[PDB]
Design a protein around this ligand. Structure first.
Ligand SMILES: C=C1CO[C@H]([C@@](C=O)(NC(=O)[C@H](C(=O)O)c2ccc(O)cc2)OC)N=C1C(=O)O
Ligand SMILES: C=C1CO[C@H]([C@@](C=O)(NC(=O)[C@H](C(=O)O)c2ccc(O)cc2)OC)N=C1C(=O)O
Ligand SMILES: C=C1CO[C@H]([C@@](C=O)(NC(=O)[C@H](C(=O)O)c2ccc(O)cc2)OC)N=C1C(=O)O
Ligand SMILES: C=C1CO[C@H]([C@@](C=O)(NC(=O)[C@H](C(=O)O)c2ccc(O)cc2)OC)N=C1C(=O)O
Ligand SMILES: [Cu+2]
Ligand SMILES: [Cu+2]
Ligand SMILES: [Cu+2]
Ligand SMILES: [Cu+2]
Ligand SMILES: [Cu+2]
Ligand SMILES: [Cu+2]
Ligand SMILES: [Cu+2]
Ligand SMILES: [Cu+2]
Lengths: 266, 266, 266, 266
């Protein structure tokens, strides 16, 4: 008789786990994750902010890169998240323990983060990571300020119920740069139509496409750089082919509409 | 350059995942886990109790065996735990969702269960499972009653800070049978001496050896059946060579004292 | 020198704490709360459901009324909530401990319930109650079924971020009765315009007015009976003057628009 | 017919809420609470530590006193607790939100803190406060270090299951001062004998008396200053009549033994 199957680990492409040196996005914003996973460090006078952290095993690499930027572990004051999946919020638990930073997230992301990604509406328990607790609950449009830099949350439910875009204004060449960190708009293997765990899934994606179009957006970044056409490996040319917020939302909606029709035919 | 390592899954010996039919221990107590992982079902007039559930992937098998015993999913009223490691408390989250049962545990096991086993004092994040919440906090010596069957908790810290033994009185051949479900007394790969995460580790193990000796104990069971010399596969002869509570505690202390001396010499 | 002020208790009108006998709403739906606080019991073949529980001190009275209906404590399987304020979700913690029932709520209500109502966006810590944990997270439009009776959740954010309406179909005189339990639409003392803790507060109220209008609604009930023109004290004539769902939403929007203009002028 | 009783607020003697200016205990240790509630600030080069915070309404006063000591809100790095009752851990939730400090506590205190003091083993829901989460779980004897100052936890269960004494070495007149912050040893209105919620209550108190006797103790402080014979109001003479650790434990045990005999006779 066959035994019950062994637990399967969440494996990803090697480029998602390929460390990279800090890549400057603007005067205070740096990509410090891996080549295929975004992790943004915003350095203020009163401490540092981290948006996403990638996979669980990236915690040490993030702290190494923070130190290359002159940010001691205890100088990290705040962790912000796009959504609480293992490949974006993986190391949050370990980062909280080692930095003393607080996590700000909306209620849906907080509840998912507190489950460690277990009981996913679409993936079940296949992408579990160490759970972490949110210290501040964020509402739609709420402003989070660290060192005088205002971060504004824009709810874009879909990929996860708590999917959030974060916008803030940096500088470059003495001119303002409105950075938009928009969450994923994919639905990989999701059941879209008549989903009992997510009955309004299609309506949420539709409004989220419109939300992404209206974001203040001089420079767009996404948790997966390829989604917005970044290439973190080519250095100072990484952002050359980056999409607008309008192009990102439009490309996402056509892929969504094609998958929706394919689901009807499958 | 080498990428960061992929996540490693918690793999175990095949016999830990080998399903078995319900094996009767006493008039109301059944082993319904696998051949090498204990999961005890106690059936009362007012519902069923489950002590431990084994690995995360055993949830369906447990519910199948409960149904073979005539226990519908919603008839499970209470889940009790020896300790909150992935191979004993793995399926607790899924069982709560599908049965409506409550979990009773002490504070140390509840805090570990709420982390999904992450941030283990000795194993780090290597044995993470879906986290679950305790509905009732139990003190040492406290009695938990379901259907008129009294379960008494005996704290035996060591293997985990929350390690607990559960005792209750069943019947067999019209005579009382005092069953003792004692937790693991192993320290596999632990640092025993001068452990900053567990400074009183040795003192706790010592008192726990004495606690196990004094348990009301006509029949001893352990989360790993081989620890108490059970053999779930040979059917009605499974308990023939089972150890006493005194023999279990004594065998454990000698292994502990030998490992302690080996640690001094290693 | 004056000392710091003593803690102030959450006091309410006496009629909110005036016990009443079970009042039948339909074949399986009963009001079992107080004269001015709704607490609905739906009795199925496979257990009972409770929607709201009123104040913290109502826990014993609810269990007394459940027993008058023939519902033993352990027969309560599910607790549903309009919103997690002290006067509607007060006794949830005690009810879970004594009945083994599970709580189903959306993420916003779960996070507020887990704080015991502390850190309210508008009331601060003035209405704290014993906190409780949600066992199942509910999405908008999701169906929750107990004993074959389907409960559908309709998010109506505003009074609280997690404010929810619950709809289900009962019977009476052999004919179907579509009951709508709609949450509060008041904003008592709220700052509506430019609220940093709730920047989209006005937009949420507006959509919630439209959501209430579109509910399947043969009979409307609200957490405060006077909001829908019930009078629980006059017995079998309690529902005579009850409002429609359209009249409730319209009366609420005019009060909201008048308060919004008064806020501009105050 | 009488209505259900209104909620009763946790009121205390005025002196528990009488603010006081910072009173220096040693080179880096200050009493910054009220006249009858201890709240200790330890200032290091790398941030500040707070042991206990008193009542919920003391949060603002604590931050005012921290600022008088030159400690900005975000400079508070760690909150430590004797036990999680409303008059000692009241403002922890608000302090975390406004300072970004982490809370370190054992599992029993963390579980009680997470309930906001509700479901007390002896007081029920009479002393509920805003709940807070522990960021680091502490074991017995574990060392917590901030700015090079080592804090050692000594479990003394009794007053609460998680009751903890904190010891550290400060300086004064160039000589070391071993400060012991020992928790309460009272059992006000407790049922000591055969308590189903706390069956080993008497054994825990007995061991805790011995634990307090053996503490490194040049200067003893307690959460209630009168328990160790401090008088915070008389300024630089506040510690003149302070008890030793041995005298405190002995005075507590005689009061405990007299109450135990009175309980047998009552
Ligand atoms: C579109 C993608 C690419 O896939 C990742 C995702 C889905 O969110 N899935 C995966 O990593 C795998 C996949 O989708 O095949 C996977 C592997 C194992 C498993 O059990 C579940 C999923 O991350 C969880 N994220 C995005 C995004 O846009 O964010
Ligand atoms: C003495 C044992 C045998 O090992 C299991 C244990 C340790 O508790 N470890 C393991 O399963 C593995 C092992 O110990 O080698 C393991 C594998 C991977 C890993 O990352 C960590 C541990 O269960 C977690 N339990 C007991 C017990 O007496 O309960
Ligand atoms: C419109 C009302 C009437 O008031 C209650 C409310 C507000 O939600 N407030 C109160 O009970 C008091 C009030 O509003 O004056 C109060 C008293 C003390 C306090 O610290 C805060 C509020 O319940 C919390 N609920 C509704 C509802 O529609 O649900
Ligand atoms: C010995 C005392 C004095 O009382 C406080 C206590 C008990 O811990 N109780 C009280 O404050 C009141 C009392 O004991 O009468 C009280 C008031 C209302 C209530 O509902 C419960 C208790 O704090 C909770 N602490 C200690 C200690 O040694 O720490
Ligand atoms: Cu994702
Ligand atoms: Cu992803
Ligand atoms: Cu183990
Ligand atoms: Cu094991
Ligand atoms: Cu309300
Ligand atoms: Cu109300
Ligand atoms: Cu106390
Ligand atoms: Cu006290």
């Amino acid at each position: 008789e066959a035994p019950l199957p062994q637990l399967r680990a969440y494996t990803v492409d090697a480029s998602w786990l390929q460390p990279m040196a800090p890549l400057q996005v603007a005067d205070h914003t740096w990509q410090i994750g891996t080549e295929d996973l975004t992790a943004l460090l915003v350095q203020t006078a009163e401490g540092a902010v981290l948006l996403d952290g990638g996979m669980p095993q990236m915690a040490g690499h993030l702290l190494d890169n923070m130190k290359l930027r002159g940010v001691a572990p205890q100088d990290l004051r705040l962790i912000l998240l796009s959504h609480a999946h293992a490949d974006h919020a993986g190391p949050v638990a370990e980062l909280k323990r080692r930095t003393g930073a607080h996590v700000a997230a909306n209620a849906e992301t907080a509840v998912l983060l507190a489950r460690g990604g277990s009981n996913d509406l679409h993936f079940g328990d296949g992408i579990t990571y160490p759970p972490a607790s949110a210290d501040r609950i964020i509402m739609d449009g709420e402003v989070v300020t660290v060192g005088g830099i205002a971060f504004t949350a824009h709810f874009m439910p879909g990929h996860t119920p708590g999917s959030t875009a974060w916008t803030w204004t940096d500088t470059r060449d003495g001119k303002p740069v409105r950075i938009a960190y928009a969450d994923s708009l994919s639905a990989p293997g999701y059941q879209l139509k008549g989903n009992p765990r997510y009955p309004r899934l299609i309506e949420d994606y539709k409004r989220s496409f419109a939300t992404v179009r209206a974001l203040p957006c001089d420079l767009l970044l996404t948790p997966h750089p390829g989604a917005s056409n970044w290439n973190y490996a080519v250095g100072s040319k990484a952002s050359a082919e980056a999409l607008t917020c309008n192009a990102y939302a439009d490309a996402a909606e056509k892929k969504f509409d094609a998958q929706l029709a394919r689901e009807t035919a499958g």
